[model samples]
Target: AVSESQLKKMVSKYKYRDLTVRETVNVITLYKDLKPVLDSYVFNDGSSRELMNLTGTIPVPYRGNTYNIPICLWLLDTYPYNPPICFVKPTSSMTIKTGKHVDANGKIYLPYLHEWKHPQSDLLGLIQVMIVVFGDEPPVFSRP
Candidate 1:
């Protein structure tokens, strides 16, 4: 659970004052619900806007090898209404896999994003899907 001070900071940064009563409530509820999940896997790069950046490692398995791939999730202002922008942040030794679900730049393209719906689509579920997809087709290594 987010502390009262922390919650206040988040609200002020995102300028909840500009939102309507309903939107403000919605954002607060979502943030509080998602904060713990985000804390478990990622570091929050606090921002003064509606965008929040989560950086963490995702364990990906491919060809009998397991790799910890760094990833970033960019949560948008109109969250719950819009899907997050996710990308694999590959190290110099890593090579991003180009697949049906991953682009050359490591941006993810998942079915979940296309089928996203407000309040129903949460960051937890999205990240879970990403883990599964990346696990199935893990990024390759440039040299192993």
Candidate 2:
């Protein structure tokens, strides 16, 4: 059984204050989208089978494009510290419409990656932060 202290311990590990206000908003949006499934697990008392069946997608951003990520939503062992990892399929494709200012290849140059920071326009909003912080491997385009 999960204890209240265990949940508190987990939430404490997360650097919530460091997240940009926009990033925090995005995270809340993602949570709202997936909470229905996540809540089922909590009510069921750590049912692994229930968690495995919980599926959803979060569109993640990388290199100036967005990729649709289909994932099974699950909470971290602690609760709030570490976020959930969507069970990403290996062959999933990453593609975003090329922006007017970007190259035909949908590539945005270096300084632009920082200076032209339009969370909604440039990258996939909050998912970009998740990619930077949580993903073990970086996402790449499957096509040009």
Candidate 3:
């Protein structure tokens, strides 16, 4: 129910205003044409609360099949320098394919995420790497 107007307000109030302003602009700029939009999704880092985050699906081409892999990208209050937490957001029909990268709860932990190095890493770049790993090993499955 929240828009970018409300989203950025939370970021500015909670996170770094200046850095996120530039980072978010570029992040959304590249994803503007896509469904990579902002939302007030709840975040849980031991503690929990609704916060501004990005949620969308990315196309994955694997075994000559195409899958719309849904995901959540939450830029924490300690962002830019801190790695954004990621998770696979499966629909009602899908069950998480937990493994080395994705946990039982659908959380992501890729080399890109674990070995995150600023400037050397970014939301766009993290997603790209996810496509590669996810293509290699599907992160979710559908049951008939």
Each candidate structure's TM-score, on Cα atoms with residue i matched to residue i, is 0.64, 0.31, 0.78
Candidate 2, residue 49: lDDT: 28
lDDT order of candidates, top first: 3, 1, 2
Give Cα distance to truth, residue 118, candidate 3, Å: 1.4
Query: Candidate 2: worst 10 consecutive residues by lDDT?
Result: 117-126
Best by lDDT: 3
Q: Which tens-of-lDDT digit does each residue in 14-115 have in candidate 2? A: 344223223333444554433223233444366542221224456555556655544343444332243443333333345433333234433323332344
lDDT of 3: 0.74
Best by TM-score: 3
Query: Local error of candidate 2 at 118, Å?
Result: 30
Residue 69 shift from truth in candidate 3, angstroms: 0.2
Candidate 1 root-mean-square deviation in Å: 7.8
Ranking of candidates on TM-score, top first: 3, 1, 2
Colliding pairs, model 3: none
lDDT of 2 at 60: 57
The local lDDT score (0 to 100) that residue 118 gets in candidate 1 is 61
